[PDB]
Design a binder for this molecule. Structure first.
Ligand SMILES: *[C@H]1CC(=O)[C@@H](O)[C@@H](O)C/C=C/c2cc(OC)cc(O)c2C(=O)O[C@@H](C)C1
Length: 305
């Protein structure tokens, strides 16, 4: 009916956060020896990432390995810096722990069974508007948390940083680095010359990317839209040229307006989190009852039961 009732942290969310905490605690010490490899998730980037079983617990996790040599007590420091990922947000990927072994940093995260939205994009081709509404909500809230707690620089909001799962959860994985770009840049115009204003830009660029199915600078221009429905050069383009936009006709005017407000070049004019939270796209999005899990499971060929 017209119930519209959950909470600030819908008790389910609150419960899932508690459950995760408890499980993280009963895992205990994290030794290379306790990990049976299941598969190789999205690899490469800074380092390969593996899906693994942790024999003691019987938990599936995502373990990311970065190669870095030296291990002189100050490592238990480098590890302590990583221990700052030990975040309590529904819009932030869970962290189990981190260790060193065999000249290799391990960072063990919660297994998100839908993977990253860059990988979903490849299976989907395009990600539809109602799904990107829910994505938008999760990202905005995730930034809100980070801004009102971690004061963390984050780094970027890209599809590769947005993980999803068959429970319909959407979490940022972008986690910072102190670690002592081929055609695509998500850098705001202002930072090509910190704060959330840069992240609002990236999210806006990423929504266009996921909506059209293609990194949108330079614009498809040459029809492509009719069909569909270097770094240095690109940077001056982002600074000099006008921001991207969704094509018309295909996307709601609400949706076009929302992304338009994220991709205003001047950050003083560009929308802040508070305005996004009450934009009509978001209001409509929040009221829509979207079967995100079913969309997602079908798209990537995940067996639900
Ligand atoms: C967080 C994400 C990254 O750092 C980036 O490399 C990401 O795109 C690579 C994918 C990681 C991934 C993939 C799946 O697919 C099923 C599942 C999970 O849980 C993860 C993940 O959380 O990896 C963490 C370590 C990196």
């Amino acid at each position: 009916q017209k119930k519209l009732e959950e909470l600030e942290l819908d008790e389910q969310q609150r419960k899932r956060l508690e459950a995760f905490l408890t499980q993280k605690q009963k895992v205990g010490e994290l030794k290379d020896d306790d990990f049976e490899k299941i598969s190789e998730l999205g690899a490469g980037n800074g380092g390969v990432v593996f899906k693994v079983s942790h024999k003691p617990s019987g938990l599936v996790m995502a373990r990311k390995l970065i190669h870095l040599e030296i291990k002189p007590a100050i490592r238990n420091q480098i590890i302590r810096e990583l221990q700052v990922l030990h975040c309590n947000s529904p819009y932030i990927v869970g962290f189990y722990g981190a260790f060193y072994s065999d000249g290799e940093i391990s960072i063990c995260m919660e297994h998100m069974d839908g993977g990253s939205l860059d990988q979903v994009l490849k299976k989907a081709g395009r990600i539809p508007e109602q799904i990107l509404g829910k994505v938008s909500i999760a990202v905005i809230k995730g930034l809100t948390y980070l801004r009102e707690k971690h004061k963390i620089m984050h780094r970027d909001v890209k599809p590769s940083n947005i993980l999803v799962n068959s429970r319909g959860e959407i979490k940022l994985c972008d986690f910072g680095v102190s670690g002592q770009v081929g055609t695509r840049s998500y850098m705001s115009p202002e930072r090509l010359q910190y704060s959330v204003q840069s992240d609002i830009w990236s999210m806006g660029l990423s929504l266009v990317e996921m909506a059209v199915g293609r990194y949108p600078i330079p614009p498809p221009d040459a029809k492509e839209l009719e069909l569909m429905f270097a770094i240095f050069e690109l940077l001056d383009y982002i600074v000099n040229e006008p921001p991207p936009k969704l094509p018309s006709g295909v996307f709601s005017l609400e949706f076009q307006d929302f992304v338009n407000k994220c991709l205003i070049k001047n950050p003083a004019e560009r929308a802040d989190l508070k305005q996004l939270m009450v934009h009509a796209f978001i209001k409509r999005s929040d009221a829509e009852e979207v079967d995100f899990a079913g969309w997602l499971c079908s798209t990537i060929g995940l067996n639900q039961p």
